[PDB]
A paper describes a structure:
Our high-resolution wild-type structure of the HR1HR2 bundle resolves uncertainties in some side-chain positions present in prior structures. Overall, our wild-type structure is similar to previously determined structures of the HR1HR2 bundle. However, some side chains that were assigned to different positions in the prior structures are clarified in our EM map. Consistent with previously determined structures of HR1HR2 bundles from SARS-CoV, MERS-CoV, and SARS-CoV-2, our EM structure shows that the interactions between HR1 and HR2 involve an orchestrated network of hydrophobic, hydrogen bonding, and ionic interactions. Most of the hydrophobic residues of HR2 are involved in hydrophobic interactions with HR1, with only one exception—V1176, which is completely solvent-exposed. Another notable feature of the interactions between HR1 and HR2 is the abundance of hydrogen bonding between HR1 side chains and the HR2 backbone. Thirteen out of the 19 hydrogen bonds between HR1 and HR2 are formed between HR1 side chains and the HR2 backbone, and only six remaining hydrogen bonds involve the side chains of HR2, including S1175 and S1196. In addition, two salt bridges, D936/R1185 and K947/E1182, are formed. Note that the HR2 fragment is synthetically linked to the HR1 fragment in both crystal structures, that HR2 is naturally linked to other parts of S2 in the postfusion EM structure of S2 (18), and that HR2 is not linked to any protein in our EM structure of the HR1HR2 bundle. The root-mean-square deviations (RMSDs) for the backbone atoms, side-chain atoms, and all nonhydrogen atoms between our EM structure and previously determined structures are relatively small.
In each case, the process of viral membrane fusion is mediated by the trimeric viral spike glycoprotein (S) that is cleaved into S1 and S2 subunits by multiple host proteases upon infection. Two heptad repeat regions, HR1 and HR2, distant from each other in the prefusion S, drive membrane fusion by assembly into a six-helix bundle. This HR1HR2 bundle formation is thought to provide the energy for membrane fusion and is therefore a target for therapeutics, as exemplified by peptide inhibitors that disrupt infection by the HIV-1 (19, 20), SARS-CoV, MERS-CoV, SARS-CoV-2 (23–25), human parainfluenza virus 3 (26), and respiratory syncytial virus. We therefore designed a scaffold to efficiently determine structures of the postfusion HR1HR2 bundle and its mutants to near-atomic resolution by single-particle cryo-EM.
Numbering used by the authors:
A (entry chain B), C (entry chain A), E (entry chain C): 918 to 988
B (entry chain D): 1166 to 1200
D (entry chain F), F (entry chain E): 1164 to 1200
The structure:
C-alpha cells in the first residue's frame, strides 16, 4: 500500500518533470531561433550600413572636390 | 542610398513555457509522499 | 524504515527540482524580456536610420542640383 | 541640416548568473537525495 | 525487492534530471553570453553611428554654408 | 571625409542544439525510469 503510494507519486512527479523538460526545450529552441535571427539582422544591418556610409563618403568627397574646382 | 527598412528583428514569446514551468513547480507539491 | 528513507529522499529531490524549475522559469523570463527589448531597440534603430538616410539623401540631391545650377 | 538623434537607443543586458548558479548547485546537491537502502 | 526497484528507478531518474539540469545551465549560460555580446554590439553600433552622423552633419553644414558663400 | 569604420561590429550566434537535444532525450528516457511494481 505504501509502496503503491510511493510508486504512484514517483510516476506523477516523473510525468510532471517530463512536461517541464519538454517546455524548457521548447523555450530554449525559440530563444535560440530569435537570438540567431536578431544576430543575422544586426549583421545584415552592419553590412548595409557600411555600404551606405561608403556611398555617402564617395558622394561627399566628390562634392567637396567639385566645390574646390568651383572655388 | 540602400534601403534597409526590410531589416526586421523578431520577438520571442515563450510565456506559455514559463507559465508551464511555474505550474509544474507548483503542482509538484501534489506529488510529495505522505506515508 | 526503508520506506521512510525513500519518502524523505523523494521529498528532498522534489523540493530541489521545484527550486530548479523556478530558477529556470526566472531565467527564461529574464532572457525573454531582454531579447524582446533588444529586438525593439534594433527595430527602432532601423526606423530612425531609414529616416536619417532619407534625410541625407534629400539634402544630397539638393546639393547636387544646386551645384548643377552653379555649374 | 539636423539629423535625428539616436543616442537614446539602448540595448539592455541580462544577468541570469544567479539562476545558472542555482541550477548547477541543485544538479550537484541532487547527489545527497539518492537512495542508499 | 520492490524497495530495491523503487530505489534503482529513483536513482536513475535523479541521474537523468541531473544531466538535464546541467544541460539547462549550459544552454542558459550560452544564451546569456550571446545576448550580452549582441547587446554590446548594438550599443557600440549606436555609438559609432551617432559619431558618424554627427560628422556627416558637420560636413553637410559646411558644404551648405560654402554653397551659400558661392551663391 | 573619412567616416568611422563599423565593419568590425559583429553579432555572435548561439548554438545550444546539443543541450535542447539532450533535454528532449532525457524527457523521452524518463519513461524508462517509471516504476512498475
Amino acid at each position: 500500500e505504501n509502496q503503491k503510494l510511493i510508486a504512484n507519486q514517483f510516476n506523477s512527479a516523473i510525468g510532471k518533470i517530463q512536461d517541464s523538460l519538454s517546455s524548457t526545450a521548447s523555450a530554449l529552441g525559440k530563444l535560440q531561433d530569435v537570438v540567431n535571427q536578431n544576430a543575422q539582422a544586426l549583421n545584415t544591418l552592419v553590412k548595409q550600413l557600411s555600404s551606405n556610409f561608403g556611398a555617402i563618403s564617395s558622394v561627399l568627397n566628390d562634392i567637396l572636390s567639385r566645390l574646390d574646382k568651383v572655388e | 542610398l540602400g534601403d534597409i527598412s526590410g531589416i526586421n528583428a523578431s520577438v520571442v514569446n515563450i510565456q506559455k513555457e514559463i507559465d508551464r514551468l511555474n505550474e509544474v513547480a507548483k503542482n509538484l507539491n501534489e506529488s510529495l509522499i505522505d506515508l
